[PDB]
A paper describes a structure:
To provide structural evidence of the binding of R-9CDHRA to [name], the hRXRα [name] was crystallized in complex with R-9CDHRA and a 13-residue peptide comprising the nuclear receptor-binding surface NR2 of NCoA2. Note that the residues lining the ligand binding pocket are strictly conserved between [name]α and [name]γ and that the conclusions drawn for [name]α will also be valid for [name]γ. In silico comparison of S- and R-9CDHRA binding mode in [name]α LBP revealed that the opposite configuration at C13 leading to slightly different side chain conformation of S-9CDHRA may underlay its lower affinity to [name], further supported by the lower relative binding affinity measured by ESI-MS. Although S-9CDHRA displays lower affinity to bind [name] [name] in ESI-MS, most probably due to the inverse positioning of the C20-carbon atom, it is also active in the transactivation of [name] in vitro with threshold concentration between 10–7 and 10-6M. Direct evidence for 9CDHRA binding to [name] was given by electrospray ionisation mass spectrometry (ESI-MS) performed in non-denaturing conditions with purified [name] ligand binding domains ([name]). Considering that all [name] isotypes share the same structure of their ligand binding pockets, the present data obtained with the [name]α isotype indicate that 9CDHRA may efficiently bind to all RXRs and induce their transcriptional activities at concentrations found in physiological conditions. In summary we have characterized 9CDHRA as the first endogenous and physiologically relevant retinoid that acts as [name] ligand in mammals.
Retinoid X receptors (RXRs) occupy a central place in nuclear receptor signaling as obligatory heterodimerization partners for several of those receptors. [name] ligands can regulate the activity of only some heterodimers including for example LXR-[name] or PPAR-[name], collectively called permissive heterodimers in opposition to non-permissive heterodimers, like RAR-[name], which cannot be activated by [name] ligands alone. We report here the identification of a novel bioactive form of vitamin A, which is the first endogenous form of this vitamin capable to bind and activate retinoid X receptors.
Residue numbers in the entry:
A (entry chain A), B (entry chain A): 229 to 244, 262 to 458
C (entry chain B), D (entry chain B): 471 to 481
Amino acid sequence: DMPVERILEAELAVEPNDPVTNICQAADKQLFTLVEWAKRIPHFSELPLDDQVILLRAGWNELLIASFSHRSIAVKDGILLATGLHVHRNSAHSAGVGAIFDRVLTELVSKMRDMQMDKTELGCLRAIVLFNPDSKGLSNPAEVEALREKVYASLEAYCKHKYPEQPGRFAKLLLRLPALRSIGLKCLEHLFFFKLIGDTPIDTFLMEMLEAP
Amino acid sequence: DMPVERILEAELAVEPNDPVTNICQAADKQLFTLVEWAKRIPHFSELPLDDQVILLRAGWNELLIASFSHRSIAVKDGILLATGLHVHRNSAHSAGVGAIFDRVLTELVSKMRDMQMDKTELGCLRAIVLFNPDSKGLSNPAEVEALREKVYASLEAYCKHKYPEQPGRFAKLLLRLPALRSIGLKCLEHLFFFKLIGDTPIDTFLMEMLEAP
Amino acid sequence: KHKILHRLLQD
Amino acid sequence: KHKILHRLLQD
Ligand SMILES: C[C@H](CCC[C@@H](C)CC(=O)O)CC[C@H]1[C@@H](C)CC=CC1(C)C
Ligand SMILES: C[C@H](CCC[C@@H](C)CC(=O)O)CC[C@H]1[C@@H](C)CC=CC1(C)C
């Protein structure tokens, strides 16, 4: 009913001077791809359209950060954008965003790397993020909670079967979500500042995500 | 090595006009009690003193929010402070902090209530929060990560044994942590504003927690 | 309100 | 730096 194979298929289907400008341009492009990803997650497109909107508006930044982070696992001290460009921490630091960039590396990329988080696992974590029953305005929170439950049930089964010798693996994956939440919130604060101050071109879809609410 | 019984004992050992003023006064008082709690968590006092400081400075707000939230489980649409005072959502709304108060109720208290989160579970979640290996400046992150691992291992065992008919319970508990992280961050923003604007007396220990870094 | 997202999600 | 916390944690 929530087959990890479909979740993996979703990940696979979507696979590809100022670093802030380059990252923001890439985020705008990846927001289109994000919508196509979400549609491939079982039961998401059967939700009411307004709830699909709520979930993507609530989760886009965590979903995109998870994706580039896992893509960056083999990169030394940097990230790999979907555009193929590598951004090193030195460049982020020299642009005034070293602190948040270092959190990304230390709390997400290195940890994904250290445990060899696989694409099924990444896919499931993202699906958990997508199905966030705390998102405000949801027509039926319980339905989304139920979908989240089916995803983590499937993830645990996957982990226990694929990595039986690591009984804490499942918990380890779920315990990267508070870091992801914190990092996503900080990235949003930054984006709102770039918008306010005018220091960075912000493309239309990214801009829409920054619109009220 | 990380007995849930010791964790429960820690919880039990510590059990007790402007709602913002009343909440801040209570938070200041509970920060003293927090230190005494942390000392009762196995292996915490054996950490280097500087790391104990880092962990408590990084986690105090999430730890205090978890505590009042679980204390408030039987309260209708409000919270119960350690001072014994009940604060209703109507009062929070009329003080300009209704939004964050409602997140607390909807994302934490009601959810703790709905699943009947017990004190051992609360205690373990708080111990996970306390042992946050992502805290910056830690002399030995790996050691703290190891302690976090022992706590969640013990929690899962506890859950599987106490509630065998709820195989998703463990995941359900861990998946309240991203909400707790988000709510704690927002509460800090509020506190920094109250400090900036001068609208609320802030006592010495709370004030110290708001000091740099 | 959120016109790009709605359009992409429709179909 | 963080004088109250250090004092409470000591012993
Ligand atoms: C919130 C976005 C989403 C990024 C997704 C792309 C990397 C898309 C892709 O190429 O996979 C990143 C924001 C950060 C941060 C991480 C780098 C430094 C400052 C920001 C600019 C604030
Ligand atoms: C961060 C603190 C910690 C509270 C602990 C006490 C409730 C202690 C106790 O009595 O258990 C709460 C902060 C919030 C919020 C929740 C209520 C409305 C605005 C704030 C004032 C910003």
